[PDB]
Each structure stands twice: as C-alpha cells, then as structure tokens.
Amino acid sequence: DKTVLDANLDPLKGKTIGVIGYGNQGRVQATIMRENGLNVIVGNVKDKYYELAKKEGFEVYEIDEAVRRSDVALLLIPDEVMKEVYEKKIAPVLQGKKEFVLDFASGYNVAFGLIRPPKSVDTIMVAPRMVGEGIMDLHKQGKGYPVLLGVKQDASGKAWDYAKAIAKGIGAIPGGIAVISSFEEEALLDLMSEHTWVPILFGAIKACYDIAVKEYGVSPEAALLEFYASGELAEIARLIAEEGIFNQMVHHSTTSQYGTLTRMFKYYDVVRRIVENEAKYIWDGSFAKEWSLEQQAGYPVFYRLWELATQSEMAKAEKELYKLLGRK
Amino acid sequence: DKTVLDANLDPLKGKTIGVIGYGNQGRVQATIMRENGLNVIVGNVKDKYYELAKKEGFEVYEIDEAVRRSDVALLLIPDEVMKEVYEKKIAPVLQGKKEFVLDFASGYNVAFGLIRPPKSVDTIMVAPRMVGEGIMDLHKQGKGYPVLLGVKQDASGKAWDYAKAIAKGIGAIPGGIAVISSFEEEALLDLMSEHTWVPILFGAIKACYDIAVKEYGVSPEAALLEFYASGELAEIARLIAEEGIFNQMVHHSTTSQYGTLTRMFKYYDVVRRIVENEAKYIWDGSFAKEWSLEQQAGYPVFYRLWELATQSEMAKAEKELYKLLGRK
Amino acid sequence: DKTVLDANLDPLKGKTIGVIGYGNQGRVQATIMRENGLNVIVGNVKDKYYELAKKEGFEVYEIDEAVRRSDVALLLIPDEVMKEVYEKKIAPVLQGKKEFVLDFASGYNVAFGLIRPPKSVDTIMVAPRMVGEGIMDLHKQGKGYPVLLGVKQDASGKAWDYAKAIAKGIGAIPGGIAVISSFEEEALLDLMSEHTWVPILFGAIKACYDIAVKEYGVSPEAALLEFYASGELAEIARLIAEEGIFNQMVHHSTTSQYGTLTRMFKYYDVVRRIVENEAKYIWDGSFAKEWSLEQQAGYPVFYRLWELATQSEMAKAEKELYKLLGRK
Amino acid sequence: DKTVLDANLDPLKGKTIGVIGYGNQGRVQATIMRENGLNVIVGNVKDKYYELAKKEGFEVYEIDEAVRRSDVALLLIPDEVMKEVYEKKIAPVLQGKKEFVLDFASGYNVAFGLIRPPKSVDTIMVAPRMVGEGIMDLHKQGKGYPVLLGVKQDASGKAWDYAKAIAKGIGAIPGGIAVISSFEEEALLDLMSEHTWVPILFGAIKACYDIAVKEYGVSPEAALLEFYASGELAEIARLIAEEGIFNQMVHHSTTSQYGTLTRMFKYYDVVRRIVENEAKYIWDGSFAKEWSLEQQAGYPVFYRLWELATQSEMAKAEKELYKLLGRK
Ligand SMILES: NC(=O)C1=CN([C@@H]2O[C@H](COP(=O)(O)OP(=O)(O)OC[C@H]3O[C@@H](n4cnc5c(N)ncnc54)[C@H](O)[C@@H]3O)[C@@H](O)[C@H]2O)C=CC1
Ligand SMILES: NC(=O)C1=CN([C@@H]2O[C@H](COP(=O)(O)OP(=O)(O)OC[C@H]3O[C@@H](n4cnc5c(N)ncnc54)[C@H](O)[C@@H]3O)[C@@H](O)[C@H]2O)C=CC1
Ligand SMILES: NC(=O)C1=CN([C@@H]2O[C@H](COP(=O)(O)OP(=O)(O)OC[C@H]3O[C@@H](n4cnc5c(N)ncnc54)[C@H](O)[C@@H]3O)[C@@H](O)[C@H]2O)C=CC1
Ligand SMILES: NC(=O)C1=CN([C@@H]2O[C@H](COP(=O)(O)OP(=O)(O)OC[C@H]3O[C@@H](n4cnc5c(N)ncnc54)[C@H](O)[C@@H]3O)[C@@H](O)[C@H]2O)C=CC1
Ligand SMILES: O=C(O)C1(C(=O)O)CC1
Ligand SMILES: O=C(O)C1(C(=O)O)CC1
Ligand SMILES: O=C(O)C1(C(=O)O)CC1
Ligand SMILES: O=C(O)C1(C(=O)O)CC1
Ligand SMILES: [Mg+2]
Ligand SMILES: [Mg+2]
Ligand SMILES: [Mg+2]
Ligand SMILES: [Mg+2]
Ligand SMILES: [Mg+2]
Ligand SMILES: [Mg+2]
Ligand SMILES: [Mg+2]
Ligand SMILES: [Mg+2]
Questions:
Q1: B44 and B77 in contact (C-beta within 8 Å)?
Q2: Sheet of strand D16-20, all strands in order from the earlier edge strand to the far edge
Q3: Which of C164, C261, D30, D304 is most buried when burial is the number of CB atoms within 10 A of its CB?
Q4: What value, to the nearest 5°, has the Cα angle with vertex C268 and ends C262 and C271?
C-alpha cells in the first residue's frame, strides 16, 4: 500500500540543511538529525530560544544567512504570521537561488495559497501528529513514530526522494511509519478535529453540568467529579490507543455498552450533517479568510470568548475544587 | 459546604463486617479496611476469585453465612443480576435480623425499586468514580480519593455516622474528599455520561473517518492517525484533569483555540436538547425497563450491534494498522 | 458464480445422523435421506407425529438419546420455543461431545444470538423456500429443488464440505440448485416478505372493497368476485413463476399493461421508503425483541387482531358467498 | 445602594493631570477641573482646536509630552482611530512609566481588547450621558450631573479612590450622581440604543409616510406635519424626562392612551426578540469586527446608505417644506 516503512538517506548527505526555529519540533528534529550524521544549521529570532539553541551547540546565524548557506530549509515556526516573515526576509534570498527545497510542518499557509514560492524550488511536507514531547519519549526508547508526507512542487524529479530522505533524517522510520498525502489532506484533517468532536465534547460536558445542577438539584462537586474532574477519560483514551476503540469497552459493564451503542447509532446522522457542513466550509477556503480577518481586526471575538468561558459557573466551581485537591 | 474532609471511625470498631465479593473494589476496599484495623469477612461464589481471596488470607464462608455473622454488609457485585441473588439467598437471612446496615457501590437497583429491604435496616451508599486500580495506585502513595455517599433508609438515627465511618474505613478521607448525595443522583450521573458525550464522541469520530474517506480522496491510515490512533486525546485528558478544561487549551495554537471556541458556542443548544431528552428518559425509570427486558429476551440487540460495530470499515482498517505498529 | 449444481457425498457416509422432528420437512428430508443410503435416526416428542414416524419405520429414541448416538443433528422444529428446548435438553448432551455438527432450516434464533452453541461444533444452515409438499411433488418426478446454505462456525475446516454433503443428502442437487448465504440473509429475506408486500397487498384489497362499497353503491358479491374470490391471482402467479414477471403481462390487454406500468413507476418511491424502514428495523434485532416479549406477555395483540380481522365486513360477506359456492 | 452622591478629592491634589483633546468634553471637563483647583495640562493635534485651547489659557504641549509630565491621563478623543494613535505615540511613553492612571469616556476600545495597557497602570472609566453642551447648561446653574464609573485594572489598590476623585474633579457630584459599572455595561448600553429603538422608530416613521401616501391618496405635507415635522415628539420627550414615561400620557386623550397601551402590550414580544438578537451580537464582539473591517475597506456601505436615505422621497419633500417654513 501507500505506506513506507524505511527508505534511503542519500540526497541529504553532502548538503547543508537550514533549520528555522528551535521550539518544540525544531529542537527535537534538529538534535535528532545532527545525531543522524548530517551538517545542519539553525536560524532563529535572537531571544531566549536562541540562548537555548546556542547553548545546545548549534551555530545560529540570522534567518536569511542560514538560507544562503543551505540548499534545504525547514520552516519550523507558527502558521499565523509566517506569511509576512516569508515575504520580507526569505523570499528575496530565495530568489537568489536556483536549486532549493522547502519543507513545512503544516499545510495551512500553502494549501490556501498564502505562500507561493517560485517554480525553482521543490516544495514538500513532513508532518507528525504528536505535540512533540512524546517524540523524545519515544526516541530514548529507540522507537520510531508516524508522519505524513506531501509534495506540492517538483522541479527536480526528486521531491519524493528528498521526502523519504528527510523522513529518515528525523528518526521516524524505521520504528514508525510514513504516509504520503497532499498538503490539503493534512490541513483538512488537522482542522476537522479542531472544529468537530473536541468542541462538541466540551459543549456536551458543559450542558450536562448545567442541566444536572439547574434542573435536578445536584451539587457542583459531584457533577465535576463524574464528568471530567476524574481521570476516567484519560484511561479510556489510553485503552483506545492500545487495544482499539470498541474492543476497549469490554472492560466496562454491559449496561454501559448497551446504552453507549444504542445512543451512538441513534445520533450518528446529526453529527454527520455537522461534519459535512464544516468540512465543506474548509475545503473552500472560507475559514482561512475568517481567521486572517479576525487577526487583522484585533482579536476581539477571541478576547470576548476567552472571557465568557472563564467567567462561567463551571469554571469557578472547578477553581474552588482544584484548589481543595491541591491541584494547581 | 456539603463536603467532608475527615470524620470518625467509632461505630465500626467492635462490630463484624460482611464483604460480598472479591473483584476489583471488593479486594481493594477489603484489604484496605483489614489494614485499617477492623474485623472483616468475605462472601463469594466459590470460583477463581474465591481461590484468590482465600489466598490473600481472608476467611470466606458462603454468602448467607457471612451475613449471619456480620451486622453490616457490603454488596460489591454486579448490577444486572444482583436482584435474583438478593431475593433467594440474602432476603431470608436478612429477615432473620433486627439491626443491620447495607451499603452499595451503585444506586441503580435501589433508586428504581428493584430492591426494597425492610425498614429494620439502615440503607446507604458509598461510591467512588475510578475504575479501581487507580485507588491502589493512590494508596501506596498514602493519598486519599473522592467518593459519593447516600442514605436511603435510617432506622437508627445513625446512618450518616456509619456512612462517614465506612468512608474512613476504606482510605478515602483524609487524603481525598467525600460528598453526600442520594442514590438517585449517583445513578443519574453514572448514566448520563454513558448516554451523552461518550457515544456522541464516538459517532463523531466515525463520521469524520467515513466522510474524509468517501468524499475527499483520503487514505484510511492518515485518518486513523489523526483522529484516535494517536495518543493525543490521552494527553489532552490528563492536562484537563491537572490544570482545568479551558486553561488546558493555552498549550495549543491560537487557530485551534479560535475554531474550538466558536464551534462550541455554536452547537451548544443541540446537545443540550439531546441531554434533556436522555436525562428525562432516565429520571422516569424507562431505561431500567428497557434494559431489564433486553436481558429477559436474550440480548439480541446487544449481539447485533456488537457485530455491526466490529464489521465496520474503520474497525478492519484499525486492525490492519495496529498489527503494523505491533500493538496487540 | 456462487451457485452449486452438484457435489460429493463423502463425509456423511459412515456417520450417524440425528433428525429432530417428523413434521413437514423432517419426514420429507428424512425419508429422502434414508432412501439416499445413510444411517439415520429420529428424535421426537412422543405424540401423534411419533406414532406416524415409528409407523413409517424410523427408530425414534428421546431427543437427547438421538443426539448422543449421532455426530450430526438437524433441528427441524419451530422457531418460537426452540430456545428453551435447546437450553434444557440439548445443551447438556452437546457439552458431552467434542466433534459435532448442527444444521437448521431457519436462521432466526441464531442470527440474533438466542442460541450460541460452543466453538466445538460446526454450525450451518440448509433452507429451502417451499412449504414442503411441493418437494415430494417434485421428488416423485426425479427432479431437484433449490435451497440456501450457510455456515456460522467452522471448527473442522470442513463445514462447507458437510454443507454440500447434506445438500445432496436431501435430493436437491442434482436437479435443482444450491446457494450459499449467511444465516442473516436468510432471516432478513424470510421476514421482508412477511412484512412488506404480503400485508400491503392484503390491505390494498381490503381498502378497494371498503371504498367500492361505501362510496359508489356496489354489491359486496361483485367486489369479492373481482378482487380475490376468483382464481385470477393464482393463474397470474403461475405464469410469473413460469415465464417471468413482465413477459407474463403479454397475455393481458394493452389497457391493463399501460395502467399497470404507469402506476408501478408512479408509486415505486413510497413502497421503497416503507421497505427501507422495515429492513432497518430487522437488521438491528428490534423485531425479535418485540416478538419475544409478545410471547412473554400472553399473545394479547395477536388475539385482538385475529378477532378484528375475522369480524370485519369483508370476512362475513366472504363467508356467506363461499357458502353459496359450496366452497368449505 | 451602588449610588454615590459625593466623595473626596484627595489623591488628585498634588499631582499633574493630562488632558488629551479640547473638543466637547475635553474643553468642558478641563475648564471645570481647572476651576476646581488642580494643576492640569492639555495635549492636542495642532489645529483649530489647538488655537482655541491656547486661546482659553491652557498650556498645550504635544500629546506624548503631556503624558511624560502627568501621572494621570484622560483620552478624550474618538473611538474609531484611537487605536493607532495609542500604538504609535502613547504606548512607548507609557512604557516609560511605572505608576500611571488612564481614564476614558467610552469603553468600546477596551471592552473588546483593541487596547491593552500594561499591568503597571490603573485603568478606569468615567462616562456621562449628555451630548456635552447640557453640562455647561447645568454648571452655570451650580447643579451636578450623572455619570458612570468603571475600573478595568487596579495596580494600586486605589483605582476606585481615583475614580471618585476624578468624578468630583469634573463637577458631577455633588449635584448629580455617580454610578459604578464595568466598561462592558457602558458599551453594551451605548450600542443597544443605537441599534434598537432609534432605527426602529425611524423606519416606522418612514413606513407610515410611504403607506399613507401610496395607498390612501394623502398629501406629503400633511404626513410630514403629523409625524415629525411638528415638535410634538420634543415636548413628549421633555415631559418624559420630567414626570415619567407613563405619567406623561395623562396629558393626552383617553383614546390615545387606550390605543397606545393596547398596541404596546401587543407588540412587546417581537421587539424583545430583536433586542435579544442584537445584544447577543454585541456581547460576543462581532459588531466591533464588522465596523473595523468596514473602516479597513473604504466605508463603501456607509456611503451608499447615506446616499439612499437622502435620495428618498420623504427627504426631498422635507426639503421643499422646510424651505417653505424658513427652516434652514
Ligand atoms: N504543539 C505544537 O506546537 C506542534 C506544532 N506543529 C506545527 O509546527 C509548527 C510549529 O512548530 P514549533 O516551533 O515546535 O511550535 P512553537 O509554537 O514553539 O513555534 C515557535 C517558534 O517560532 C519562532 N518565532 C516565534 N515568533 C516569531 C517571530 N515573530 N518571528 C520569527 N520567529 C518567531 C520562535 O523562534 C520559536 O522557535 C506549526 O506550524 C505547527 O503547525 C505540529 C505539531 C504540534
Ligand atoms: N470498573 C468496575 O468494575 C467498577 C464497579 N463499580 C460498581 O461495583 C460493583 C461491581 O464491583 P466489582 O466486583 O469490583 O466489579 P466486577 O465486574 O469485577 O464484579 C465481579 C464480582 O462479582 C461476584 N459475582 C459475579 N457474578 C456472580 C454471580 N452470578 N453470583 C454471585 N456472585 C457473583 C463475584 O464474586 C465477582 O468477584 C458494580 O455494581 C458497579 O456499579 C463502580 C466503579 C467501577
Ligand atoms: N411448512 C412450513 O411452514 C415451513 C417450515 N420451515 C422451517 O422448518 C422448521 C419447522 O419444520 P416443520 O417440522 O416441517 O414445520 P412444523 O410446524 O410441522 O413443526 C412441527 C414439528 O416440530 C416438533 N415439535 C413441535 N412442538 C414441539 C415441542 N414442544 N417440543 C418438541 N418438539 C416439538 C414436532 O416433532 C413436529 O414434528 C421451522 O423452523 C421453519 O422455519 C421452512 C419452510 C416452510
Ligand atoms: N457628542 C459626542 O461626541 C460625545 C462623545 N463621547 C465619548 O468621548 C469621546 C469623544 O469626546 P469629544 O472630544 O467631546 O468628541 P469629538 O468628536 O469632538 O473628539 C474630537 C477630538 O479628538 C482630536 N482628534 C481628532 N482627530 C484626531 C487625530 N487623527 N489624531 C489625534 N487627535 C485627533 C481632536 O483634537 C478633538 O479634540 C468618544 O470616545 C465618545 O465615546 C461621550 C458622550 C458624547
Ligand atoms: O461511568 C462509569 O463509572 C462506568 C460504569 O460501568 O459504571 C465505567 C463506565
Ligand atoms: O494546533 C494543532 O495543530 C493541534 C493538532 O490538531 O494537532 C494541536 C491542536
Ligand atoms: O382484470 C382483468 O380481468 C383483465 C382485463 O384485461 O380485463 C385481465 C386483466
Ligand atoms: O396625536 C395627537 O395629536 C394627540 C391626540 O390626542 O389627538 C395628542 C395625542
Ligand atoms: Mg492544528
Ligand atoms: Mg491534530
Ligand atoms: Mg456505569
Ligand atoms: Mg462513571
Ligand atoms: Mg417465515
Ligand atoms: Mg419465505
Ligand atoms: Mg455611541
Ligand atoms: Mg448614548
């Protein structure tokens, strides 16, 4: 199938590599690669992270100076401002090149056309799915992790070879796997989660609390303990990742199984409709517009919602309680 | 407030205690109490668990023989068959008593009237919220855990004193806390979760998979990795339990925060309606009827759904994949 | 294709066979097989049918005694009570075996999990589609008939070989055919008919009668003669089975063809919706629950409907008329 | 209650005050305060208003120069551009301070997060409800007026003391009153009016005119005279402010009272729904976004609507008429 369990490391040996940033990924992937036998450099904004990077023994020039020396570059930085940074300080230099290769962690800014490098640059993606600390939590075990790979532009007939070369250049395969997928799929997926089941889950919990309290005379403490103040969800998620989502429920009671299955097959259509709506909203590029404008206005809605959420009853009760249990 | 952080241990010292069962709770609570300085006994069906109980040094008679010797009894056994067991082998003996006390882990069978002991028995509840192994995972740390307490019938003016006595008799407070609550609240809560956000979550995930695959040319492996085959959810749940549900999201990107909050406040009404419907269905006693009948018929629906779920596309793909990653 | 026109008879020669029942199928299939050169026995409730079976020269022990002697067993008895009979008088004995094979006529009780034999028994189906008398009405002609075959559990790598062996052991192929199909498909099909076009047909006839009488001043006799008191439908059905459903209509008038076709293509969506609803109701296992409970209550609805139907106007008129025509 | 009828003047005596602007409020409040015995200064854009300010005897430096000298600052300028002005010319200087206090007239830019001063500055509000000329029209009478007060950030445990100090520093209490209220309430209120009853009123008048003319053959002049070209509304509003909204209607005829009351209680739900929608739209921060973007695009909609309104029939007729009556 489309999977790839291991591959070569030929094109990247002999070349210099440009790593932009020393955050979560940047540090991890960079240290890994240095330890994989390659000549690498770092580009960073001269601040605390720069202190830490030069600490760990990585020569760090300015961004553009690291792009002049390298024939490859990894832009391991945020998604909300990368546009301007690329426009001012990277595009000029890049125009001062002929054979180059650029790789990202996310496909947001490219899938939607906010960044359109020239045709003289092979354009690719390599994206994992962790938060970043799990990857050292796996590397010290000598394991490997899974990732997604994509190619946007090939001007060398070699983008895929560089793709798998990089893949092995970060310690994913062998030990994990590597999937090949467009920039578009990656963005679509990373967003669907952030728009569909996470917020639905949270709203459902909030509603259960509000209902139980204001309509059957229950104490906030008990509600919080049942719903999320207990680590039940965490163990469930672990068992899911280990055994399987359904096989997991065998460790539950028959009553729970019955209710859960019935209600699942009873509400599948509604959420399906919702997911359709949101995925369509995304595929078209509307959400990117919405978000970019909300940046350009001053983040008002962001502000007001962050306020409302924290000034809700549930949050205050959680505050009192977490205080009681010593939890910070 | 209604909370209780510590209390006495007076009524239970000098009396014998009857522990019915040696499963997860039974073993844990029983060993704890023995180690808390009390004279205890065990009643069990003579099978593997009986071997393990007599192994760990607990004299174990027959059930009814343990109820004749004890003035207290803890029925630490399932919720689906306990009815018959109480009718045949416990009610007679109990009628052969005057001052007795009975406590449960769950309020299902009592809140709905499937078990109505005489008026010569103080009736109570003590219910934690773990799965059971976390409690030793906390006891070896000398900590304490939270629980719920309830009283159904008082024929001694002392049910609450026995309640807190038991509470401390199992190593919850001091170290955790103890909430007081009817049998009804406990059942309502344990069920709302099993009917509202768990199945909704699962259906949403399933729908995201189905959509992404059958409508945007996406490979199954990537979908599974993004949604649940990765341990993302587990870390999120842990951070929730530690910091707070909302404060958790600070460790995410602004884009995720924005989308999540907007969509949460956008879909809150729908799930609210759903939760209303289900909670009402429960408060009335309809679900208990449904479930009892489904038992009396031969568990057909249970069977067919357990089949359909496992014969779905997502499950088969998860099978192939988990095999690849070595996960059992 | 999946069809099978003939096969072997090897595994069943040398073994003893257990036939449970001497009703329509039991007698027919048993006599056929005896005449096909096999050593067979019979198990039956000692009543009139037992008299008839021992009459026709089949040694008949008790049920369980016939299962102890046989390595195969055919449960040729009803679907509504077979559960208890299997639980009490068959499951014990079967537990007293290692290599066994069990076959049914219908898949109701198995497809829905009301009967779950051990894993040490190959489980199969062989189901024809007649009412039973047509099969002798074909055997004396040396023909063969069609059937469905299914396998639920294979503990021998041989369930299919036994399947076709049995198939030929009853005189179906060669002469007819044999289709392979799950238990589930068989039940689904046998029920869809009993829920979709039969009752719709009957209700349509009833409605035509009621309308014609109470709204255009027509005589009951004429209505009954036109609709069903005449053998028109029978000849139509015969021609359907012989030539084909559509090619049949050539023997009609052009007017009939035109009206029929137009109205058929005009009402196809409605009945489609209905059929969807009912098939879904079945696939899930709800109907089995409904029916089992209606048994457990005392067949009240059954009773009241059997009353209403017979106390309707159409039935009384049919009574008077059939009396006139000498029809019993 | 929350009201405050008079308070102290202690913290502001000995300190210098920074007044930004010399418009309606700026001039009024500044002259008042100077006349209340305080050392004050002015910051202004060097234009006509600057001429007038230096005319009236207020030393006026540049904006930032007035913020360097003052330990307090009052930003008495518009709400639509204040953002940039604060970003460029005020934030730097303010960063060059430790103990500072800032007060506004409106809470728009702060309630929605368009301006977030540091935590080393106590942030407050003092907002009246006039248009500004009424305040001298009251001061020469030695009266006092009502205002709203708010505190956004306290880094001194003294924000409220400065609040009431300022309050008395402008001649409101004693003589009027002072209410305490968040920035949020002030903005919400100032906007609800501008979105709910003003535009509804205007649309109702417009519709009455259009209807009367185009459907019962009436002359424009009469319609205009009845509806608003007469000063009826003004006298009604005055009586409202004086006596009370309802007690006002006693000076009317019984017929008017009856019709008005009935129709009021008959249409209360509709407008309630409308008001809910708009208030919700505001609380969330959507309107601020809308307005900021409409600025960033070039005020197109503003333009087109200002055109349509003036090119309507009613406006032209009003033009002809007001000309007739000599009204400019
Ligand atoms: N939890 C996470 O942060 C994960 C990030 N990703 C993706 O990788 C990218 C981020 O990777 P990380 O660096 O590990 O996360 P991060 O949030 O720590 O990235 C911050 C980095 O960007 C640099 N930076 C910040 N502001 C800058 C500015 N104004 N100008 C120039 N440089 C600036 C900083 O040097 C810093 O190293 C994102 O695009 C994301 O889609 C993928 C998986 C998880
Ligand atoms: N994950 C869990 O199992 C938790 C259980 N509870 C509640 O506690 C009760 C169950 O406690 P556990 O024993 O720890 O769970 P369990 O599922 O391990 O219960 C098995 C025990 O029940 C006894 N038993 C089982 N079948 C029996 C039968 N036919 N006849 C006589 N005795 C039989 C056995 O002695 C066995 O030890 C339930 O009511 C549940 O509501 C509360 C929190 C979590
Ligand atoms: N003729 C029909 O109505 C059709 C029957 N089938 C299927 O075959 C099976 C029945 O086969 P048949 O015997 O030919 O129909 P049947 O209605 O004549 O069944 C009566 C047989 O069941 C046995 N029996 C009845 N009550 C019993 C009891 N309380 N305890 C023990 N044994 C009892 C008797 O030995 C009797 O011979 C059904 O499951 C049906 O799904 C399939 C095609 C047509
Ligand atoms: N009738 C009104 O306009 C009232 C105003 N308010 C609130 O008070 C504030 C306005 O108060 P006023 O000064 O009396 O109204 P205003 O409209 O006369 O304010 C204009 C002032 O802002 C200065 N200014 C204008 N454009 C500038 C620019 N590009 N750069 C720097 N400075 C500029 C001018 O020097 C002028 O003094 C607003 O925030 C409003 O919410 C409250 C009650 C009524
Ligand atoms: O909600 C609960 O605590 C569970 C139960 O079976 O009672 C584990 C699912
Ligand atoms: O910000 C992202 O990209 C997250 C993801 O879905 O992987 C953490 C939320
Ligand atoms: O209904 C009838 O009798 C038919 C006719 O053509 O008249 C044969 C169909
Ligand atoms: O509309 C009018 O002129 C009023 C009347 O009573 O006629 C005063 C209200
Ligand atoms: Mg994301
Ligand atoms: Mg993600
Ligand atoms: Mg439960
Ligand atoms: Mg629970
Ligand atoms: Mg049938
Ligand atoms: Mg049939
Ligand atoms: Mg305003
Ligand atoms: Mg106003």
A1: no
A2: D60-61, D39-43, D16-20, D72-75, D100-104, D121-128, D147-153, D178-180
A3: D30
A4: 140
Sheet holding B39-43, edge to edge: B60-61, B39-43, B16-20, B72-75, B100-104, B121-128, B147-153, B178-180
CB under 8 A, 24+ apart: contacts of C279-284: C279/C188, C279/C192, C282/C187, C282/C188, C282/C191, C282/C192, C282/C195, C283/B304, C283/C188, C284/A265, C284/B301, C284/B304, C284/B305
Tokens of D302: 């503003």
Query: In which region does residue D100 sit, left (phi positive, over 0), alpha (psi from -120 to 50) or beta (all else)?
Result: beta
- Chain A CA closest to residue D295: A297
CB contact at 8 A, A183 and A125: yes
List the domains of chain D with CATH numbers. 1-181 (3.40.50.720), 182-328 (no CATH)
Across the interface, whether the CB atoms of D112 and A294 are under 8 A apart is answered: no
Task: Name the CA radius of gyration of chain C, rounded.
Answer: 23
In angstroms, how far is the first alpha carbon of chain B from the final one? Answer: 47
Q: Which helix (H) or strand (E) holds C68?
A: helix C63-69
The owner of tokens 């065998």 is: A250
Residue from A111, A108, A175 nearest A138 by CA: A175
Judged by phi (left if over 0) then psi (alpha if -120 to 50, else beta), residue A230 lies in beta
**Nearest chain A alpha carbon to B243:** A328
> In this structure, which residue's CA is closest to atom 25 in ligand 2?
B77
Q: To what resolution in angstroms was this structure determined?
A: 2.5
Distance in Å from the first CA to the final CA of chain C: 47
Question: What DSSP letter does each residue of B168-226 carry, written as one string?
Answer: HTTT-TTTS-EEE--HHHHHHHHHHHHHTHHHHHHHHHHHHHHHHHHHH---HHHHHII
Q: In what helix (H) or strand (E) does residue D69 lie, and over which residues does it extend? A: helix D63-69
List the helix and strand counts (H, then E) for chain A.
17, 8
Rounded distance between C-alpha atoms, residue C141 and residue D105, angstroms: 106
Region of B183 (left: φ > 0; alpha: ψ -120 to 50; beta: rest) is alpha
- Cα separation, C115 vs B164, whole angstroms: 47
Q: Where are the beta strands (DSSP E) in chain C?
A: 16-20, 39-43, 60-61, 72-75, 100-104, 121-128, 147-153, 178-180
Going across the sheet that includes C147-153, the strands are C60-61, C39-43, C16-20, C72-75, C100-104, C121-128, C147-153, C178-180
Is it true that the peptide bond before A174 is cis, omega within 30 degrees of 0?
yes
Closest among C178, C71, C177, C163 to C124, alpha carbons compared = C163
Closest CA to C25 of C6, C2, C5, C49: C49
Which strand (E) or helix (H) includes residue D150? strand D147-153
Give residue A196's identity as a one-letter amino acid code.
T
D296 contact residues in A (CB cutoff 8 A): 296-297
Structure determination method: cryo-EM
Query: What are the residues whose beta carbons fall under 8 Å from the beta carbon of B273, sequence distance 6 or more?
Result: none
Give the number of other Cβ atoms within 10 Å of residue B307's Cβ: 14
What DSSP element (H or E) covers B162?
Answer: helix B159-168
Inter-CA distances, B210 with B224, B322, C89, Å: 11, 19, 47
Residue carrying structure tokens 């306990």? B82
What number of residues does chain B have?
Answer: 328
CA dist., res. C38 & res. C29, Å (int): 12
Amino acid at site B88? K
Residue A195 near residue A278, CB atoms below 8 Å: yes
CB interface of A with B, residues 4-43, below 8 Å: none
Cα–ligand 4 centroid distance for B199 (angstroms): 56
Backbone angles phi, psi at A42, to 5 degrees: -135, 140
* B190 annotated among ligand-binding-site residues: yes
* Continuous segment of H or E residues that includes residue A85: helix A82-89
- Which residues are CB-neighbours of D49 under 8 A, at least 6 positions away? D21, D22, D23
Strand, helix or coil at D121? strand
